[PDB]
């Protein structure tokens, strides 16, 4: 089922803390989702799909997450 918070985080492999949903529907820790997308040029840690919601910042020469991460309460 979508949105479950009891699966391993696909980034850090631990119990998810501060869950959020990625553009691909998978759940990760909030800082894990942010850091993975920034560090991997906007690619999903589960599917390696190039995500629509990540944008390249020409000033910092780094990727940022503009849309596509949603927190779970
Ligand atoms: Zn994590």
Author numbering: 2 to 74
Q: What did the study's authors say about this model?
A:
Luminal peroxisomal proteins are imported from the cytosol by mobile receptors, which then recycle back to the cytosol by a poorly understood process. Recycling requires receptor modification by a membrane-embedded ubiquitin ligase complex comprising three RING finger domain-containing proteins (Pex2, Pex10 and Pex12). Here we report a cryo-electron microscopy structure of the ligase complex, which together with biochemical and in vivo experiments reveals its function as a retrotranslocation channel for peroxisomal import receptors. We propose that the N terminus of a recycling receptor is inserted from the peroxisomal lumen into the pore and monoubiquitylated by RF2 to enable extraction into the cytosol.
By contrast, neither RF2 nor RF12 is a canonical ring finger. RF12 deviates even more from canonical ring fingers. It contains only five, instead of seven, conserved Cys residues, and lacks the second Zn2+ atom, as seen in both the cryo-EM structure and a crystal structure of the S. cerevisiae homologue that we determined at 1.5 Å resolution. RF12 is therefore not predicted to interact with an E2 enzyme. The structural features of the ring finger domains are consistent with results of an in vitro polyubiquitylation assay that uses isolated ring fingers and the E2 enzyme Ubc4. RF10 has some low activity, whereas both RF2 and RF12 are inactive (lane 4 and Extended Data Fig. 8a). RF12 is an activator of RF10, as it greatly stimulated the polyubiquitylation by RF10 (lane 5), in agreement with previous results. Mutation of L398 considerably reduced the stimulatory effect of RF12 in the in vitro assay. Thus, RF10 and RF12 probably function as a unit in polyubiquitylation.
